Design a protein around this ligand. Structure first.
Ligand SMILES: [Zn+2]
Lengths: 51, 117, 151, 150
């Protein structure tokens, strides 16, 4: 549903919008600081994420 | 006008002292020497004599601002050997090299030359 | 002329606080002129420094922890690379990506031809410069820049 | 002596890929005599004159001062412990930034590439035997290059 609304917001279909808080850069910081191994299985339950 | 008198470039001020020593706390066994009214002529040479010494871990100098006659020397040595002694020795050593250079020069001039004086 | 106005300037108008402008949410100031050309020249992968030159540069830095990093080349003689010394300057863990986009490498499809590092991408991680030359695109007043990420 | 992460004797396929070439630093393209591992690596050709016909010995280690860690940094010229992989003609210190193979498939996790950075001198290895030793980790890994054999 959000995807469908978002197409109406940007009919010209540009991917580049101004927003606060760089989420990719923060997530990227989480991997770098906690030393998360990309190969090892993660220790996170998805429902915790959604909530 | 605001230009200093040019002699103020090298004469020590009556309320100042020639060298000052302060400890650094960032790392153990290290020192910061302040040389006032001195320039690259002195600062650069003392850096090279210290780096020659193998007990010295780090040595460097920086003139904090060009308009301001003063240099700082950071030196760091092994725990087994005080950094102050290396500096004193480094000057004396340097004094010795220049003295030998002066004796060899006068003698070299003394070599079969004419119009030497 | 007062403590209230001195407080108001120190807190509101003072230059480290005028850095990222709201005029167009990118930094107002970045590295300029002669230094900027010297930074380009310096980060190239071919720059190497002896123990003396590194100690001299370390001596000019400000927040330097005091621990000389291990040179990227130990043998046959000690050598520090340019990027490496630069990594002492980059704050705690500031981390960019991309921003390679000079006229060096390819108008894009070349780098995908497998990441033959080419030598132009600017990658930094945990506040340590991993690879690639710095320039107007990284340090300049461009929205995506290194100076933007520090602030 | 350091716990060996990787060890092999390599042959040079080419010294100038694309051929573009530059000063002081040069990019080697190599292949391991096991013929199961590939290598791309920068070296300081100004202080280590490589040749196209040369056959090199390469070693990768997680430490030097024997077995304990060295994460102190601070190269410490005053050490004298013969623990060192010092017999080698060319040694570099550096960090790993990427490692990097197909894992999407069934089981997969087969065939692997490591990217290493030695202060801006880049390295790339392909394998599968280094699967226990490649890690995207802090500045820790050393490349020791030696002898260039005969
Ligand atoms: Zn374009």
């Amino acid at each position: 549903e959000d995807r469908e609304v978002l197409r109406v917001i940007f009919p010209t279909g540009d991917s580049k919008v101004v927003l606060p808080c760089n989420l990719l850069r923060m997530i990227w910081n989480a991997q770098k600081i906690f030393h998360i191994n990309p190969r090892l299985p993660s220790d996170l339950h998805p429902i915790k994420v959604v909530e | 006008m605001n230009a200093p008198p040019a002699f103020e470039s090298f004469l020590l001020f009556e309320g100042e002292k020639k060298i000052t020593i302060n400890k650094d706390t960032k790392v153990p066994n290290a020192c910061l020497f302040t040389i006032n009214k001195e320039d690259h002529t002195l600062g650069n040479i003392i850096k090279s004599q210290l780096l020659k010494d193998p007990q010295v871990l780090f040595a460097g100098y920086k003139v904090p601002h060009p308009l301001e006659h003063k240099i700082i020397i950071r030196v760091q040595t092994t725990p087994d050997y005080s950094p102050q002694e290396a500096f004193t020795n480094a000057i004396t050593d340097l004094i010795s090299e220049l003295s030998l250079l002066e004796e060899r020069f006068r003698v070299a001039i003394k070599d079969k030359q004419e119009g030497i004086e | 002329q007062s403590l209230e106005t001195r407080a108001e300037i120190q807190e509101l108008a003072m230059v480290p606080r005028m850095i990222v402008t709201p005029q167009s949410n990118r930094p107002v100031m970045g590295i300029v002129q002669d230094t900027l050309t010297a930074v380009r020249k310096f980060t190239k992968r071919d720059v190497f420094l002896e123990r003396g030159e590194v100690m001299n540069l370390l001596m000019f830095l400000s927040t330097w922890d005091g621990k000389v990093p291990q040179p990227a080349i130990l043998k046959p003689r000690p050598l520090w690379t340019g990027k490496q010394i630069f990594s002492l300057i980059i704050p705690g863990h500031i981390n960019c990506i991309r921003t390679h986009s000079t006229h060096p490498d390819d108008e894009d499809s070349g780098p995908y031809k497998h990441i033959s590092p080419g030598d132009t991408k600017v990658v930094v991680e945990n506040g340590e410069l991993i690879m690639g030359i710095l320039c107007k695109k990284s340090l300049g007043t461009s929205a995506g820049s290194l100076v933007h990420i520090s602030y | 002596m350091a716990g060996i992460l990787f060890e092999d004797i390599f042959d040079v396929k080419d010294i100038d890929p694309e051929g573009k070439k530059f000063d002081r630093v040069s990019r080697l393209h190599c292949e391991s005599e096991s013929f199961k591992m590939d290598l791309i690596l920068d070296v300081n050709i100004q202080i280590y004159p490589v040749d196209l016909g040369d056959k090199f010995r390469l070693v990768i280690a997680s430490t030097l001062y024997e077995d304990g860690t060295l994460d102190d940094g601070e190269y410490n010229p005053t050490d004298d412990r013969p623990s060192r992989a010092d017999q080698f003609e060319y040694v570099m210190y550096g960090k790993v930034y990427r490692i990097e193979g197909d894992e999407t498939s069934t089981e997969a996790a087969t065939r692997l590439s490591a990217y290493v950075s030695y202060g801006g001198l880049l390295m790339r290895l392909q394998g599968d035997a280094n699967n226990l030793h490649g890690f995207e980790v802090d500045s820790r890994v050393y490349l020791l290059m030696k002898k260039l054999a005969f």
